[PDB]
Amino acid sequence: DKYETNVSYKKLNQLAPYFKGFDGSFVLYNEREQAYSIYNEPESKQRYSPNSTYKIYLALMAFDQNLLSLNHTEQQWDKHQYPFKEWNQDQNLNSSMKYSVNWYYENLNKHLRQDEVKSYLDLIEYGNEEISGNENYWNESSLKISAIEQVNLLKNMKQHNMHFDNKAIEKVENSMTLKQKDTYKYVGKTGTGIVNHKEANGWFVGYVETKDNTYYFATHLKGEDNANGEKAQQISERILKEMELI
């Protein structure tokens, strides 16, 4: 249920107003200073379903297993009518990440042996590593990860500490790039979990890369409703702008 760590951190308790209406957390890791800053340390260690934020690592596993190639990420739509018309069309990695196209990533998972998935989640230390709850174990099911762990995995990915190809990481980074200026690249991914027909679990995770540093972040929202990726991203952008990072 909870990630155990004793790392020191700077308290960010005056970020509380941004989380009106939610039990929330914000985690920041400053790469140059090797330093964490956290709002709501108890929630930062609580593990929650990753929902669409898991697509990052399904993409990487798929490259590593050669289901996807640096120049070959297209998948054909099978004509199932989804309620989101963005999903009702052929996709590549960039479009599937942008439009958070579940079937693209479900197909990837279907062609990964679940024993291989367990091995990957062990190696990258993906939260509770529990994938037995449902075929789509990352969607409001058994697999859960905390906000600090989301930051840790992004930093391990970008710092080339995972056993994934650097060019595959670049492709996944590109697929989640939200803004690129001369002074910074802003990368991130939303997620939303539905419980009792309400938005009860919102994520936004990513990083800002500047010309001299990288700032990794994760925002989590818990609530009875309205806790979704869009709101988690809005709060994140308010915080990051106050930090003068974007």
Ligand SMILES: *C(=O)N1C[C@H](NOS(=O)(=O)O)CC[C@H]1C(N)=O
């Ligand atoms: C990912 O969490 N999902 C797929 C899609 N988009 O969500 S996102 O924009 O927050 O990434 C719909 C919601 C959600 C899901 N439960 O499948």
